[PDB]
PDB file of C-alpha atoms in Angstrom:
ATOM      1  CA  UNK A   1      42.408  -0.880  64.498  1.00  0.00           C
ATOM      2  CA  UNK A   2      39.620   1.375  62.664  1.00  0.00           C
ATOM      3  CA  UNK A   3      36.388   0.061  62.315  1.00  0.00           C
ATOM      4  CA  UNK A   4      34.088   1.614  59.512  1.00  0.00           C
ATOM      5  CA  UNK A   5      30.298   1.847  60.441  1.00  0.00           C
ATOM      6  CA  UNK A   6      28.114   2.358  57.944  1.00  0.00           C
ATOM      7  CA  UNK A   7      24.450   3.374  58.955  1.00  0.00           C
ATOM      8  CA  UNK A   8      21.841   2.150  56.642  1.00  0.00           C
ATOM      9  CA  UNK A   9      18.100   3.747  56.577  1.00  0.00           C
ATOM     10  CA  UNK A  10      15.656   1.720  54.322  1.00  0.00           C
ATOM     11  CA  UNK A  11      12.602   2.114  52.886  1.00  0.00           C
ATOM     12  CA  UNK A  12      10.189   0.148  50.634  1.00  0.00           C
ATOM     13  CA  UNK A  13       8.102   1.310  47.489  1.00  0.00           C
ATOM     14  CA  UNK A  14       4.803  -0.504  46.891  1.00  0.00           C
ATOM     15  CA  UNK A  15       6.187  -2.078  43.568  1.00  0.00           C
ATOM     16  CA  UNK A  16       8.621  -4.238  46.927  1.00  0.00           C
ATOM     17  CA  UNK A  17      12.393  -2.140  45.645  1.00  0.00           C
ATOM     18  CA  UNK A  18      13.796  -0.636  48.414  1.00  0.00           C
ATOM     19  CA  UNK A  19      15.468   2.465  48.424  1.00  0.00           C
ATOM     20  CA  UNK A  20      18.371   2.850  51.001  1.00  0.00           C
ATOM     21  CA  UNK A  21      19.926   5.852  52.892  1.00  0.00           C
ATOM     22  CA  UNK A  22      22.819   5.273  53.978  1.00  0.00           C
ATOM     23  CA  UNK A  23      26.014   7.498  56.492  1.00  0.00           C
ATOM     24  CA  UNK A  24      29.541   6.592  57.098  1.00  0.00           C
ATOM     25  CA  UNK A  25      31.048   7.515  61.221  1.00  0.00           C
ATOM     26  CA  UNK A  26      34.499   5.423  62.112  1.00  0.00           C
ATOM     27  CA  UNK A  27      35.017   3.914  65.456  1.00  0.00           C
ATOM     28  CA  UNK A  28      38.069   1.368  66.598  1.00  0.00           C
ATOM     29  CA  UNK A  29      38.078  -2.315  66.850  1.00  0.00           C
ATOM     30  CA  UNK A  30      38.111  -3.530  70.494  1.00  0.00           C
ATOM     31  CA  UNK A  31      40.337  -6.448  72.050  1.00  0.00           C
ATOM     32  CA  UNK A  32      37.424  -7.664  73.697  1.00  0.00           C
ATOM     33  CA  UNK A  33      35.824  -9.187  70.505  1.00  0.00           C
ATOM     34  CA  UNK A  34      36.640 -10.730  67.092  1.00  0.00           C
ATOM     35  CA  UNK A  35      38.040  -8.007  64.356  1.00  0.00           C
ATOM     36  CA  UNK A  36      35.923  -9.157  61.806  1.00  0.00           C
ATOM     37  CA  UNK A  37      32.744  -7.557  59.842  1.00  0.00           C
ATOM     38  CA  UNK A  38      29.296  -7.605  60.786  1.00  0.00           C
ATOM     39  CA  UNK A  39      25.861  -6.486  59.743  1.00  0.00           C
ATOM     40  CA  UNK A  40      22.428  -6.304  61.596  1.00  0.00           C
ATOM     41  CA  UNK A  41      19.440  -4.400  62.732  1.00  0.00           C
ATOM     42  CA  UNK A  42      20.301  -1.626  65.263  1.00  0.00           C
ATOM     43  CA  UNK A  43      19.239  -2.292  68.739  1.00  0.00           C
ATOM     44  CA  UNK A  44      20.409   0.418  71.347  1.00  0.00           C
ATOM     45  CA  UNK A  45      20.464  -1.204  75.122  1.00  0.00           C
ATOM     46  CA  UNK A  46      19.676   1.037  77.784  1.00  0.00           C
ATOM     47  CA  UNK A  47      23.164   0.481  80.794  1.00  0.00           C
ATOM     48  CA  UNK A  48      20.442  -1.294  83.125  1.00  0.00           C
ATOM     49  CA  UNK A  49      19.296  -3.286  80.280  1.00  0.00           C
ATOM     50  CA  UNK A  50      21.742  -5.854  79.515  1.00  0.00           C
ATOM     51  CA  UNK A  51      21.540  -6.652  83.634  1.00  0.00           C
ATOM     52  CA  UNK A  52      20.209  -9.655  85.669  1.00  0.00           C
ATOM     53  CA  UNK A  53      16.495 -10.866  84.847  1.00  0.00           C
ATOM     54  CA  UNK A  54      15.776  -7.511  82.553  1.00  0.00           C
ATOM     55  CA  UNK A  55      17.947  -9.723  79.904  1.00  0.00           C
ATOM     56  CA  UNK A  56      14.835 -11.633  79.516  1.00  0.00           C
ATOM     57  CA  UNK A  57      12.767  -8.560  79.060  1.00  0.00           C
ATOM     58  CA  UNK A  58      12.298  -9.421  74.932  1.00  0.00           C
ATOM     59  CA  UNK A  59      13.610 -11.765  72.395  1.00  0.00           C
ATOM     60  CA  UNK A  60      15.166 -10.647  69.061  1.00  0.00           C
ATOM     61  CA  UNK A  61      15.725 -12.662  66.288  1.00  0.00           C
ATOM     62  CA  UNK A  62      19.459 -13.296  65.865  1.00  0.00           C
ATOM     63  CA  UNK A  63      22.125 -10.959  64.272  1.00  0.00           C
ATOM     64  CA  UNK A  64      21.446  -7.717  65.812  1.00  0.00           C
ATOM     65  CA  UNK A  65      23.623  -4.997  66.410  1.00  0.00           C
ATOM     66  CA  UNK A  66      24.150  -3.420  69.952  1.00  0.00           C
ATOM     67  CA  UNK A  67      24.270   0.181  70.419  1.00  0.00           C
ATOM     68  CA  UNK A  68      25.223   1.127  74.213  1.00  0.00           C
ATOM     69  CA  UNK A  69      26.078   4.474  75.155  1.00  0.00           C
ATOM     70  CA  UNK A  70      28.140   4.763  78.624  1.00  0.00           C
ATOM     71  CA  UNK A  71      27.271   7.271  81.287  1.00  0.00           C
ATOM     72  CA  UNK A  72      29.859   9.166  83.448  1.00  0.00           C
ATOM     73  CA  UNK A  73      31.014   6.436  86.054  1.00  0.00           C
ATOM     74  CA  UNK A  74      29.822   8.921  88.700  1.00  0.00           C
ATOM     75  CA  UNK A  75      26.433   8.354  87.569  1.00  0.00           C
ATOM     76  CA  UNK A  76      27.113   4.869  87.700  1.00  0.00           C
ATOM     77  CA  UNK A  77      28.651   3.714  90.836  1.00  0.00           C
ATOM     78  CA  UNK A  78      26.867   0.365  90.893  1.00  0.00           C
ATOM     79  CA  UNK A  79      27.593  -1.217  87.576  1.00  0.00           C
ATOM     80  CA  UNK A  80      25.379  -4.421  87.450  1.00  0.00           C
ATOM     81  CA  UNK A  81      28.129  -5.793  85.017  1.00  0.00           C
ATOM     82  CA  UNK A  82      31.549  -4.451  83.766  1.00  0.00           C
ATOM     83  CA  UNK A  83      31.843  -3.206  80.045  1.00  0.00           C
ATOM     84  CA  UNK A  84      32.851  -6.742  79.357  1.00  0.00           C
ATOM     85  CA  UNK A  85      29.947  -8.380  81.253  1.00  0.00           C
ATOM     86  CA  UNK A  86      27.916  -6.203  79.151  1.00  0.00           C
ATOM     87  CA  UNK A  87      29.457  -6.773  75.203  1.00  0.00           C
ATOM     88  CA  UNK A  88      29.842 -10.717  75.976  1.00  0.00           C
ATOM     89  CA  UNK A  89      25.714 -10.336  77.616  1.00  0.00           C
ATOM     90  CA  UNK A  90      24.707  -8.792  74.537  1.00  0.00           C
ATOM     91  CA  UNK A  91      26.334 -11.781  72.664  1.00  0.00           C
ATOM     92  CA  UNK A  92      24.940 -14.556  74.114  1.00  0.00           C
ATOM     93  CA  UNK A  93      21.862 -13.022  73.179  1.00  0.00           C
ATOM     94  CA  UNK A  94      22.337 -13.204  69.894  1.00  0.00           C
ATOM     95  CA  UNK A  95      24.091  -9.789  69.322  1.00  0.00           C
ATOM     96  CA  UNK A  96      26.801 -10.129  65.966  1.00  0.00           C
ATOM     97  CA  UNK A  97      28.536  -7.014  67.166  1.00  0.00           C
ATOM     98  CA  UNK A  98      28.257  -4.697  69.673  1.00  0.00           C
ATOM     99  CA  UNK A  99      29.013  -0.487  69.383  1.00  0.00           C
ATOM    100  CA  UNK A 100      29.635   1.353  72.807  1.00  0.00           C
ATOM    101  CA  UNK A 101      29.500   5.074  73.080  1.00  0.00           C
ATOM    102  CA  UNK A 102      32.500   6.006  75.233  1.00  0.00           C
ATOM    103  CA  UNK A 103      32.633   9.846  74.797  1.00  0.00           C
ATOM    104  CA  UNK A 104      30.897  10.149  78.676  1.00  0.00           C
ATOM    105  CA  UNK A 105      33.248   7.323  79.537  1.00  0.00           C
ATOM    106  CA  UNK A 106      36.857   7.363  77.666  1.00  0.00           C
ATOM    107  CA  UNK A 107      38.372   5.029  80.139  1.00  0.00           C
ATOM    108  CA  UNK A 108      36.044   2.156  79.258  1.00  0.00           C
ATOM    109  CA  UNK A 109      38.466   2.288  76.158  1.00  0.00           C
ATOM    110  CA  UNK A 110      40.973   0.691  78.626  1.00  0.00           C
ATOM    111  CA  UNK A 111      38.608  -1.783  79.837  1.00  0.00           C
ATOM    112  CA  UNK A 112      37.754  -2.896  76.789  1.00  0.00           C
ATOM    113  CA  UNK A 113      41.074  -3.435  75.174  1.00  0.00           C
ATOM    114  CA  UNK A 114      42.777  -4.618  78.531  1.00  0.00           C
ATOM    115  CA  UNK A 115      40.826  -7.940  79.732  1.00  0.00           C
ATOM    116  CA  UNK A 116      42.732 -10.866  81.251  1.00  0.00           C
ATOM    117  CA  UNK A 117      39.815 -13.630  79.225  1.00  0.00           C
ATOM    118  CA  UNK A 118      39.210 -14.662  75.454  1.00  0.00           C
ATOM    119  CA  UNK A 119      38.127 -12.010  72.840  1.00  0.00           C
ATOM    120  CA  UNK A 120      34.464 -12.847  72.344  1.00  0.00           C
ATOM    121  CA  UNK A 121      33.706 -14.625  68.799  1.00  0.00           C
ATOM    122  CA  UNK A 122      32.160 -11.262  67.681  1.00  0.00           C
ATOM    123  CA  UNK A 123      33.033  -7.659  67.013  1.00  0.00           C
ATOM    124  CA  UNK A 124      33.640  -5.452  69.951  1.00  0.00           C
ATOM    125  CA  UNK A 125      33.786  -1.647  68.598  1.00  0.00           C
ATOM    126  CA  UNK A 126      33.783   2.016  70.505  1.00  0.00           C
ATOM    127  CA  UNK A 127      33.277   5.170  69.132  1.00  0.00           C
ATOM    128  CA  UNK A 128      33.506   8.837  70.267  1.00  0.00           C
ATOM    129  CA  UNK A 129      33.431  12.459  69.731  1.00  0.00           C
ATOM    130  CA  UNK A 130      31.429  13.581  66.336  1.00  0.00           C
ATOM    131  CA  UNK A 131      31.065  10.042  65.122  1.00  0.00           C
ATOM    132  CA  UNK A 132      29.643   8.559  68.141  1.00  0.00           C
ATOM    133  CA  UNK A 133      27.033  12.208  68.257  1.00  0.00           C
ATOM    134  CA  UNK A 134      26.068  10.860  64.443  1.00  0.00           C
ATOM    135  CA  UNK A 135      25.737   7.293  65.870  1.00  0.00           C
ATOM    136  CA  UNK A 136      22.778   8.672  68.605  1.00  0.00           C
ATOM    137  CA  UNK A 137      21.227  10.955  66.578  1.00  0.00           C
ATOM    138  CA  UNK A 138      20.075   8.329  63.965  1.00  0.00           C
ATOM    139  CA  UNK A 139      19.573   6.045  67.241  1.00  0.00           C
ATOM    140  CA  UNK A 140      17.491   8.748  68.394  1.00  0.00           C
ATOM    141  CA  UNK A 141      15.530  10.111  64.986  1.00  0.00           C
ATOM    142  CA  UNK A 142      14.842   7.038  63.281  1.00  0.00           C
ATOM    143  CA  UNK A 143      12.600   3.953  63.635  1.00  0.00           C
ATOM    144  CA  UNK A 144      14.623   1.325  62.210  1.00  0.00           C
ATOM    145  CA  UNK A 145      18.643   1.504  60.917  1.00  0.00           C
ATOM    146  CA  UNK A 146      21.025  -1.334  59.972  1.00  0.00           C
ATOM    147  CA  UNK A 147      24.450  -1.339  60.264  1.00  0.00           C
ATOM    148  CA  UNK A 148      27.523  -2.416  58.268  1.00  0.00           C
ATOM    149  CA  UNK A 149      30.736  -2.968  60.231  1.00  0.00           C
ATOM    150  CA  UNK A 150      33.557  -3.202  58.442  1.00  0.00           C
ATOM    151  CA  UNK A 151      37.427  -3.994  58.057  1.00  0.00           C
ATOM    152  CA  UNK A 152      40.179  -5.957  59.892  1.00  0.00           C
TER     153      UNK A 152
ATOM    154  CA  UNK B   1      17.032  17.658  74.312  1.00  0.00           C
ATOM    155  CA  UNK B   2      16.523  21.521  75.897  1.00  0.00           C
ATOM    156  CA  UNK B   3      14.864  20.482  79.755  1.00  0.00           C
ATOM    157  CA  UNK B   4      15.852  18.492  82.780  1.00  0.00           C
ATOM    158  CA  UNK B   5      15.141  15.399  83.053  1.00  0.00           C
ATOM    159  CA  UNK B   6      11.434  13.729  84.069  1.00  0.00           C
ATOM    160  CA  UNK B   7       9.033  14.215  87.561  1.00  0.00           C
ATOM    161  CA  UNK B   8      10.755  10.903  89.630  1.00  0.00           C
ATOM    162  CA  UNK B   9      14.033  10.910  87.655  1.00  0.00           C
ATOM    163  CA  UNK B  10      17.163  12.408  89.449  1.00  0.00           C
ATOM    164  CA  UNK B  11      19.831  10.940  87.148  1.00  0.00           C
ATOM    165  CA  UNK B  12      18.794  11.760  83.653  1.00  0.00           C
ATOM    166  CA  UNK B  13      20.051  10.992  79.691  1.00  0.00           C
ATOM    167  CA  UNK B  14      18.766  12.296  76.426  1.00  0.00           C
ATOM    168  CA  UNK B  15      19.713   9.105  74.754  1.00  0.00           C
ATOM    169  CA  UNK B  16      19.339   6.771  77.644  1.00  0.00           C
ATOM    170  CA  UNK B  17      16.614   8.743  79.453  1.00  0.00           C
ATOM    171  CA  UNK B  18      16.054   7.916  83.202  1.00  0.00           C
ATOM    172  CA  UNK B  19      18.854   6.761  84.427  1.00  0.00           C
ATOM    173  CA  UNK B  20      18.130   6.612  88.592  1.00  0.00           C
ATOM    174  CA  UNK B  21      14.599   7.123  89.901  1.00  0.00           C
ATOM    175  CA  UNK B  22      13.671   8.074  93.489  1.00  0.00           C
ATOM    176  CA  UNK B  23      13.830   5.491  95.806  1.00  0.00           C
ATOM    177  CA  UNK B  24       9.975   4.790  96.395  1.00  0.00           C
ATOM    178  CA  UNK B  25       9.847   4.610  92.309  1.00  0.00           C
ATOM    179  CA  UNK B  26      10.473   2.033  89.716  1.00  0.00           C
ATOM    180  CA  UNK B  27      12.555   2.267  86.365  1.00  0.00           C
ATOM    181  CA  UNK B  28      11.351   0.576  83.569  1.00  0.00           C
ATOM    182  CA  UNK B  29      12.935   0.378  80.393  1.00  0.00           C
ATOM    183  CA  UNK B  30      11.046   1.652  77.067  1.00  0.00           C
ATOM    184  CA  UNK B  31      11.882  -0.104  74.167  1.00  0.00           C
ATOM    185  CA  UNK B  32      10.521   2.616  71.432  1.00  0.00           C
ATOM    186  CA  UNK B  33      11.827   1.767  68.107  1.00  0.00           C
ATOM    187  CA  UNK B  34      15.659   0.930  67.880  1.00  0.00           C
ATOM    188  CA  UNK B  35      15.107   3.319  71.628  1.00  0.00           C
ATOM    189  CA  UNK B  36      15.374   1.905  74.996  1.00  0.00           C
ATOM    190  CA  UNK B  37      15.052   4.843  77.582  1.00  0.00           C
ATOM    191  CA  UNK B  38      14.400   4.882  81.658  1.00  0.00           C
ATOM    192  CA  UNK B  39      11.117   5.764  82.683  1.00  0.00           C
ATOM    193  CA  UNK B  40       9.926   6.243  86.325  1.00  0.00           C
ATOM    194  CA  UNK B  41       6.749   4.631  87.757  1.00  0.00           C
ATOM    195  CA  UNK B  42       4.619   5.206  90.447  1.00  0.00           C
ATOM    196  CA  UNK B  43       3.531   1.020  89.824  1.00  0.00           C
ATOM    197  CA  UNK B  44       4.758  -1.576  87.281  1.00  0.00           C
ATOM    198  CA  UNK B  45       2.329  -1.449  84.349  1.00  0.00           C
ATOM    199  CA  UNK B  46       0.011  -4.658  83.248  1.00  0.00           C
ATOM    200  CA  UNK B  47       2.050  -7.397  82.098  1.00  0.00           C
ATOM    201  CA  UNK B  48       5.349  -6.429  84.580  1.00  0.00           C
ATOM    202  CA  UNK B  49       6.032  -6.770  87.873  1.00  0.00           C
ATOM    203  CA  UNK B  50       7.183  -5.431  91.150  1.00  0.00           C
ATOM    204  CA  UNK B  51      10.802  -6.917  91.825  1.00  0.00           C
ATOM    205  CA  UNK B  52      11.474  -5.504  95.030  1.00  0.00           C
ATOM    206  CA  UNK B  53      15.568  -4.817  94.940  1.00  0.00           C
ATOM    207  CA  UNK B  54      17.396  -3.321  97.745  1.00  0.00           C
ATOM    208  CA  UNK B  55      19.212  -1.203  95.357  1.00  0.00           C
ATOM    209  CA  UNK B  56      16.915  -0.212  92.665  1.00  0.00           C
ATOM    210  CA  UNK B  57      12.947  -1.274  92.340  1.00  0.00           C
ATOM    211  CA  UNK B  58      12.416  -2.346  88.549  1.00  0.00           C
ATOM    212  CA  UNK B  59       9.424  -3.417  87.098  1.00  0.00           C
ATOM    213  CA  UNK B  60      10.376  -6.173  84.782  1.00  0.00           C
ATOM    214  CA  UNK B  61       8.055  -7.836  82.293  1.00  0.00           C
ATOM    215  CA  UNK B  62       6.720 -11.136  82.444  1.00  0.00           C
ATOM    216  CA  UNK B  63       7.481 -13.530  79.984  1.00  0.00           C
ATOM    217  CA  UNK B  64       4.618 -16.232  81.294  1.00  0.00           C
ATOM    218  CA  UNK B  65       1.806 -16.549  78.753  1.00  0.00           C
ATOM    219  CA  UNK B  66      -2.004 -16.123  79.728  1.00  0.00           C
ATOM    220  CA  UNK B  67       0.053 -14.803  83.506  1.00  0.00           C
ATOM    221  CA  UNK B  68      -1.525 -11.588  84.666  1.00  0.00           C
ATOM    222  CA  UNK B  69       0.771 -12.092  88.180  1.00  0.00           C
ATOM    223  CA  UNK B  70       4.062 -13.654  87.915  1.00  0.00           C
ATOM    224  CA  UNK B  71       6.608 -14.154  91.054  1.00  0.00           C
ATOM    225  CA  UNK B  72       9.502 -13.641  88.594  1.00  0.00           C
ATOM    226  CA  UNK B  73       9.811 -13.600  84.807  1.00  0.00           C
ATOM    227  CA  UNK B  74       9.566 -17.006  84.385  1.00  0.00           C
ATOM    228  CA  UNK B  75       7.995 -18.188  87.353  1.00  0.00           C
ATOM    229  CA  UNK B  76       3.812 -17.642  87.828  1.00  0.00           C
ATOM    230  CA  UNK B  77       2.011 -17.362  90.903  1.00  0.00           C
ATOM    231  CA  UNK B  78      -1.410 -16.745  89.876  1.00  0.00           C
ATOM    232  CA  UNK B  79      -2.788 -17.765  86.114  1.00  0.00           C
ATOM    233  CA  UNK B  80      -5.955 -15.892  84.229  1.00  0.00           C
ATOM    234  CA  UNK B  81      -9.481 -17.111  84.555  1.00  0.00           C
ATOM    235  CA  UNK B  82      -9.605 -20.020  83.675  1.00  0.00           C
ATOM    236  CA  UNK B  83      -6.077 -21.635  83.334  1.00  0.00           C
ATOM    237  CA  UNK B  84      -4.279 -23.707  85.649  1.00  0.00           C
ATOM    238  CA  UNK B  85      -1.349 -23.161  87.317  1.00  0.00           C
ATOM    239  CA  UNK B  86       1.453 -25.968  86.349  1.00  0.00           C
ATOM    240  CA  UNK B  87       5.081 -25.624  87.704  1.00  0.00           C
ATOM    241  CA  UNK B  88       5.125 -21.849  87.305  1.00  0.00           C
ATOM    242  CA  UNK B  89       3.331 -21.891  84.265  1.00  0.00           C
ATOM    243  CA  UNK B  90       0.026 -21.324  82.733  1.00  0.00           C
ATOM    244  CA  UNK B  91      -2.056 -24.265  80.455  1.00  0.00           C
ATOM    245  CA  UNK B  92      -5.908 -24.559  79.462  1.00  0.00           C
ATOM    246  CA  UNK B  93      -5.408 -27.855  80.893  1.00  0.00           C
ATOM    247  CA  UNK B  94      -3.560 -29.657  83.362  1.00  0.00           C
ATOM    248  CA  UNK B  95      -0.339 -30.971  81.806  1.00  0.00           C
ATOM    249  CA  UNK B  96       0.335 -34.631  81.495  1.00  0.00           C
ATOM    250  CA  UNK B  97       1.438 -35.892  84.479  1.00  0.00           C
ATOM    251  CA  UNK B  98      -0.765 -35.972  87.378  1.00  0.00           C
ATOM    252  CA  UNK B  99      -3.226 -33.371  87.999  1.00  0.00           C
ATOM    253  CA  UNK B 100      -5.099 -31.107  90.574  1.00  0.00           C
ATOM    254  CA  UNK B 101      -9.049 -31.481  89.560  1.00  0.00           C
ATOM    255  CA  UNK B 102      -9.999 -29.393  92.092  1.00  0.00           C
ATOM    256  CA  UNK B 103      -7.480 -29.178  93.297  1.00  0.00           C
ATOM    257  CA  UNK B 104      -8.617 -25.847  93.314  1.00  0.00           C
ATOM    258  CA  UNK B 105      -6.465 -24.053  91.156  1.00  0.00           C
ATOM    259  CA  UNK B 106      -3.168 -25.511  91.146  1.00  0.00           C
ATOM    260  CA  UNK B 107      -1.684 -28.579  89.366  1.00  0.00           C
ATOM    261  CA  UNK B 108      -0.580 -31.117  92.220  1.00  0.00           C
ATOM    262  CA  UNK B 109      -0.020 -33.499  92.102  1.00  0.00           C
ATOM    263  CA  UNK B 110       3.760 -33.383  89.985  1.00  0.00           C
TER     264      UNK B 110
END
């Protein structure tokens, strides 16, 4: 179930074309959401930040794209919400997909794609290894990125 | 991403920075950029506050507008000079409905 995430940089001239930047990483379609495509402004959500009350912390306007990277369940023994909790949090406000980084955490894979409930209405995609390393260091270099999420 | 992690931190992240603070301290999430990183406080900043959790103190912002002290993120308990202070939230004037008029502060009646 491959997901293809495109990473697009943008910038604007002062005539108003803009000239894009754009990298391809590959990730897998999760059973939790939708398989279908989606596109929107990159917003990575810190673990504790998709948790009671700090969900109201700002609002952004619909269609954005969640980018979560997992920590080693050791470091989290108190999960405020399961990996489920979190992707269908991040939906109902107003996320069209949502990327987790699973490389810490490889068994979240399994909690993901094994859930008793309804697939959420939108995209639910992991990635790992080099791809998911890409992923965070555009999260971490650059101001603003959009991404493309595509196939199946 | 060369050092340990930061002064109150003992559970750190280069993406996610602080990820536990010390138990007198308070997290609070950074949103730089596309960012959101773990930072730990001594006190919650201007326009947070201190929610007081038996398993991690946060400082979480406030979401009231003209607030400067807010019970929770959408409840107030004390509105800026000079606003009144309807059900939790802040007006230049006593909403419609019945009113305080010194009623020194606070809009009661309903």
């Amino acid at each position: 179930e491959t997901a293809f995430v495109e990473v697009v940089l943008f910038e604007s001239s002062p005539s108003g074309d803009y000239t894009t930047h754009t990298t391809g990483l590959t990730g897998r379609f999760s059973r939790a959401g939708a398989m279908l495509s989606a596109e929107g402004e990159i917003v990575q959500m810190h673990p504790l930040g998709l948790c009671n009350n700090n969900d109201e912390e700002d609002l952004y306007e619909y269609g954005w794209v969640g980018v979560v990277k997992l920590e080693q369940p050791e470091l989290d023994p108190k999960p405020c919400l399961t990996v489920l909790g979190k992707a269908k949090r991040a939906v109902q406000r107003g996320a069209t997909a949502v990327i987790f980084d699973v490389s810490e955490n490889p068994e979240a894979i399994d909690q993901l794609n094994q859930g008793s409930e309804d697939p959420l209405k939108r995209p639910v995609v992991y990635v790992k290894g080099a791809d998911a390393i890409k992923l965070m260091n555009i999260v971490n270099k650059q101001k603003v990125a959009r991404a493309r999420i595509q196939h199946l | 991403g060369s050092q340990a992690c930061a002064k109150g931190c003992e559970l750190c992240s280069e993406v996610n920075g602080c990820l536990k603070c010390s138990p007198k301290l308070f997290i609070l999430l950074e949103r730089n950029d596309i960012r959101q990183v773990g930072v730990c406080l001594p006190s919650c900043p201007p326009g947070y506050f201190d929610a007081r959790n038996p398993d991690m103190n946060k400082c979480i912002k406030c979401k009231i507008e003209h607030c400067e002290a807010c019970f929770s993120h959408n409840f107030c308990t004390k509105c800026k000079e000079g606003l009144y202070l309807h059900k939790g939230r802040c007006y230049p004037a006593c909403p419609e409905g019945s009113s305080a008029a010194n009623g020194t502060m606070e809009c009661s009646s309903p």
